[PDB]
């Protein structure tokens, strides 16, 4: 009788949700059309109608009709409500001002109309669960209006976003630094927690941990699928110790402006390699703080951990994890911050993870999901702020944004907003005596 509403926006957001919603159907035993092959575990991501049909609680919105069509006419045709699965009118076309002012404006009223029609069927609602990007117009500007309207229409609902950060070294869009700076005014005080999943983790974790070479985005999104299923399973599967969504928010986040954790899914190993070693609780916890396994291209040795939240799945005994935490706290390399001596959680769920057909993950007795808040993500903006001001200095690619109605001064307003946010991580990294 408790449930979590999801919204997936952007081309990046909709396809990482197709990997999310293939996993939700294969976790609870639900066919790709809706009916059970023949509990209350459905009532977190699934609504049960008169028949066996399980309509999904997500709403997929994007301004490109092209990417929304292959899920409209794909194997999940009968699953999604065809009026939930909402399309756009014209592409946002990699422009924040387009997705915020001129062409994303004619879709806010219909999107918020469907969030109201979905939240009243809700009875024990915990919070939203956002899915967008930082590069394109509808992944950045259209979600900015969403956080603008959901903050005033709902208020006390705890929203969480699984953002895909612009990669520091490779990149696919030229003006995506512009889109990743102006979105920060609306992800700071209009977002309760914000997960960052950069395209440098499965860039090389799928190469070193998994023996498969040449990964593509249908393998990128499965790891993003696994982590969200791991987080919400405490709402969804019983355990020796469960971590509610509101449980998870106030514990991991220190400060109202510091809500930008990292991520790590440790037992990512191939099928032909998994039987070569035992996967113990201590081993899989020691393998998750390693600087070659985090979800963002940032070295955690530069920063200090504030507070870490760990969610375990499946066969985990709650003594080995306490032995694992004590063993991994006494090592000097992983250094925590002084004003948070405990800095840890545990979370137990009985049900082991599923593996989708065709996946390169191997299924495990135990899976740990490590969610760490670091001040090493201070320099996540350092290679983006230098990425930003070099383009901004000579008014490059500015005429499009001011040509769509966005004022020039709102560029520098977002510039100083991130500069103040960088100052916060310099303030909290200083020890007090």
């Amino acid at each position: 009788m408790r449930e979590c509403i999801s919204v997936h926006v952007g081309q990046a957001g909709v396809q990482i949700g197709n990997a999310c919603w293939e996993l939700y159907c294969l976790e609870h035993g639900i066919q790709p059309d809706g009916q059970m092959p023949s509990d209350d575990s459905f009532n977190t991501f699934f609504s049960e109608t008169g028949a066996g049909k399980h309509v999904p609680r997500a709403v997929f919105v994007d301004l490109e009709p092209t990417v929304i069509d292959e899920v409209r006419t794909g194997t999940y045709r009968q699953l999604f409500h065809p009026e939930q699965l909402i399309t756009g009118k014209e592409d946002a076309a990699n422009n924040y001002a387009r997705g915020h002012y001129t062409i994303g404006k004619e879709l806010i009223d219909l999107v918020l109309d469907r969030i109201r029609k979905l939240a009243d069927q809700c009875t024990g609602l915990q919070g939203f669960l956002i899915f967008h990007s930082f590069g394109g117009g509808t992944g950045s500007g259209f979600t900015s209006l969403l956080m603008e309207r959901l903050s005033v229409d709902y208020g006390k609902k705890s929203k969480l976003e699984f953002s895909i950060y612009p990669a520091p070294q490779v990149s696919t869009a030229v003006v995506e630094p512009y889109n990743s700076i102006l979105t920060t005014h609306t992800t700071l005080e209009h977002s309760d927690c914000a997960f960052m999943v950069d395209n440098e983790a499965i860039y090389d974790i799928c190469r070193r941990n998994l023996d498969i070479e040449r990964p593509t985005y249908t393998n990128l999104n499965r790891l993003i699928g696994q982590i969200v299923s791991s987080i919400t399973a405490s709402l969804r599967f019983d355990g020796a110790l469960n971590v509610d969504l509101t449980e998870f928010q106030t514990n991991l986040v220190p400060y109202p402006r510091i809500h930008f954790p990292l991520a790590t899914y440790a037992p990512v190993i191939s099928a032909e390699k998994a039987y070569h070693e035992q996967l113990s609780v201590a081993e899989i916890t020691n393998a998750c703080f390693e600087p070659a396994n985090q979800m963002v291209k940032c070295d955690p040795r530069h920063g200090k951990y504030m507070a870490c939240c760990l969610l375990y799945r499946g066969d985990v005994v709650p003594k080995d994890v306490n032995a694992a935490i004590a063993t991994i706290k006494t090592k000097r390399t992983i250094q925590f911050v002084d004003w948070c001596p405990t800095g840890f959680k545990v979370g137990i769920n009985y049900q082991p993870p599923t593996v989708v057909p065709g996946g390169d993950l191997a299924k495990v007795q135990r899976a740990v999901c490590m969610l760490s808040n670091t001040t090493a993500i201070a320099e996540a903006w350092a290679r983006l702020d230098h990425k930003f001001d070099l383009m901004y200095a000579k008014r490059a690619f500015v005429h499009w944004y001011v040509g769509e109605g966005m004022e020039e001064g709102e560029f520098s307003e977002a510039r100083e907003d991130m500069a103040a946010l960088e100052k916060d991580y310099e303030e909290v990294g200083m020890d007090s005596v």
Partner: protein
Amino acid sequence: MREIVHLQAGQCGNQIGAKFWEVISDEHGIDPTGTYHGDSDLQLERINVYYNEATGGKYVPRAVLVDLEPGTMDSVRSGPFGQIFRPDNFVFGQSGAGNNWAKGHYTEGAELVDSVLDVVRKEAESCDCLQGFQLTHSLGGGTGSGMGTLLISKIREEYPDRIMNTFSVVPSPKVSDTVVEPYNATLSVHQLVENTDETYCIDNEALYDICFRTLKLTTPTYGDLNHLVSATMSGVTTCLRFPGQLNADLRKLAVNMVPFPRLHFFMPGFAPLTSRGSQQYRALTVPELTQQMFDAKNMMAACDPRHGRYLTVAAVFRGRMSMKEVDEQMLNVQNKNSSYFVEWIPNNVKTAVCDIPPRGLKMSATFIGNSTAIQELFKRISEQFTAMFRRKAFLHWYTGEGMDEMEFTEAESNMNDLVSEYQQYQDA
């Protein structure tokens, strides 16, 4: 005839609480339906201490159960016991307490106060006399420390004369579970020291320690960590339930246990917990061997007696024994090493006995200790809080919930008062 009503708050309070009702039903011959199926008449003649009498044969246990997450209520009801429990007595909320004391004591746990104080009231007028109260909870989250302390306050004005007992699970640095555990516990024990008469402290670290070092098992999860360890101590109330030779109920044991009306924090223990292999290697009598529990390998708290002095000791015994050798062991345990005992209290130890031991053991004992070394368990969490309060680590989830800055300082000062008294009577 002489009644005490159980209070259950929190996920930890419910799991230990549910396991507690399994032990007493095993002892009193009560099944997971309510009916009696045991042997001796000395079991039902005091069924009116913990149990209430249903239509025919059935005995419904009086125990309020409360949590803010209904998953724990589903676990206790769909459990190895549970049909004995009263569904009307089961009371919960809608959303969880969020591991926050402020939200579990002020803004979300206060909506359930009328309903939880009702089911206490309806289980208070069915008593011939109310001997006392009894609560199982924890100091980690808002379900057990938040609402639990709110249960401590609201019952105290209505029943001031009657004693009230709490089974607290205090935090430990070696077993860290919540980052807010140093916020929650230092502010809860402000309300465990003002309006309680005697309380017990059972940290998880010593629960893991005695379950590994003595019991000789490999994976101690929480279920078997309470059945033979934590729920056996809760049977200290056998003086209310079973005939004894000279017995001390929850009133008699506690009144000459606490020395001063705001210094009552005790160390529990259970004597026979040998192993599953070495039980036929030693003798279940009371020599200087199984009765000298000074070595803390059989202790339910982290701090050992070596770093303090015993203010007052109680020990309730079970089985067909004589009361000389327990009395001369008191001579033999105080005079062998009197430097670890309070000088101005010449008799520091109490002995009570009952004639009916738990099944499977022909002789059993439960040990309760008031030590001046319990401040070492409170001084350690003081510095866990001051270092985390100097930078205001997780403060604003308390500030927006109707409680100001000053209640943190009062809670820190009252614990700093409490650690000073345990230090003041350390040597005198």
